[PDB]
Every structure is written in structure tokens, then in C-alpha cells.
Paper text:
The fungal Bromodomain and Extra‐Terminal (BET) protein Bdf1 is a potential antifungal target against invasive fungal infections. One attractive target is the fungal BET protein Bdf1, a global transcriptional regulator. BET proteins bind chromatin through their two bromodomains (BDs), BD1 and BD2, which specifically recognize histones acetylated on lysines. We show that Bdf1 is essential in C. glabrata, and that inactivation of both Bdf1 BDs induces lethality.
We used a peptide array comprising histone sequences with diverse post‐translational modifications to probe the ligand selectivity of C. glabrata Bdf1 (CgBdf1) BD1 and BD2 (CgBD1 and CgBD2). Like other BET BDs, the two CgBDs displayed weak binding to mono‐acetylated peptides, enhanced binding to di‐ and tri‐acetylated peptides, and strongest binding to a tetra‐acetylated H4 peptide (H4ac4; acetylated on K5, K8, K12 and K16). Substituting a conserved tyrosine implicated in acetyllysine recognition by a phenylalanine (“Y/F” mutations Y166F and Y343F) abolished the interaction with acetylated peptides on the array and in pull‐down assays, demonstrating binding specificity. Crystal structures of CgBD1 and CgBD2 confirmed the expected BD fold (comprising helices Z, A, B and C), allowed comparison with human BET and C. albicans Bdf1 (CaBdf1) BD structures, and revealed details of the ligand binding pockets defined by the ZA and BC loops, including six structurally conserved water molecules. However, a major obstacle to the development of antifungal BET inhibitors is the requirement for a fungal‐selective dual BD inhibitor (a compound that inhibits both Bdf1 BDs with selectivity over human BET BDs). This challenge arises because the ligand binding pockets of Bdf1 BD1 and BD2 are more divergent than those of their orthologous human BET BDs. Structural modeling predicts that CgBD1 would also engage I‐BET151 less intimately than Brd4 BD1, since CgBD1 residues Arg150 and Gln154 point away from the ligand, unlike the corresponding inward‐pointing Trp81 and Gln85 residues of Brd4.
Residue numbers in the entry: 124 to 237
């Protein structure tokens, strides 16, 4: 329909995800957490709603976000999941905070809808 964010906003967010993916600090966040391959079997006992950068990109490409703020909601979910599972001051979480700060700066430059 016409309820997903329009192309200019979609493309700006896709650019921001591309940019974040060039940060080496994004490496833990590039793909969904696989608790078997990573041997962290309790992951889904703590994490109800997993999120990662590829999933955000896929949702952008599927025109599934209704507002730019919903993209930020998913990004914050991704990093808060790490804070809960790995810990607020764990290396992975702090790498998440670093990419989150960069993402926020790009999201401040989102073009207006109209």
C-alpha cells in the first residue's frame, strides 16, 4: 500500500544501515543471532524479540516500516537485547552502542516526508 515510509525515507535509512555495516563494530550485529552456531543455547530464554541489521535491512526493503521512528525502535531493540543477554558493559553491547550512536546521527538527517 502507501503506508510504508516513502522511497526518499526508505533510501535514507538503507544508506544509514549500509554505513553502519561498514563499521567494524557492527560485525556482531550483521546477521541474526544463531544460538547453535554461536553456542549460546539460553539466548531465547532471555530474548523474546531478536533483531539484527540484516533483518532491519530486509524490513526496509519490504516497505514494512510505517515511520522512521519504527526503524529506531528496532535498532534500539537490537542493542537492548545485547545489553540484557551479554550485559550492559559487555564488549558486544558496547560495540552496539557505538553503531547506535552513528545510526542516530544519520537518522537525524532523515528527509522530510512531504
Amino acid at each position: 500500500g502507501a503506508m510504508g515510509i516513502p522511497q526518499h525515507q526508505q533510501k535514507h535509512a538503507l544508506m544509514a544501515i549500509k554505513a553502519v555495516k561498514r563499521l567494524k563494530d557492527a560485525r556482531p550485529f550483521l546477521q541474526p543471532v544463531d544460538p547453535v552456531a554461536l553456542n549460546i543455547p539460553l539466548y531465547f530464554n532471555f530474548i523474546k524479540r531478536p533483531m539484527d541489521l540484516q533483518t532491519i535491512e530486509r524490513k526496509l526493503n519490504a516497505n514494512a516500516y510505517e515511520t522512521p521512528e519504527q526503524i529506531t525502535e528496532d535498532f534500539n531493540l537490537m542493542v537492548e537485547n545485547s545489553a540484557k543477554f551479554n550485559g550492559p558493559t559487555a564488549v558486544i553491547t558496547q560495540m552496539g552502542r557505538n553503531i547506535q550512536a552513528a545510526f542516530e546521527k544519520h537518522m537525524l538527517n532523515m528527509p522530510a516526508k512531504d
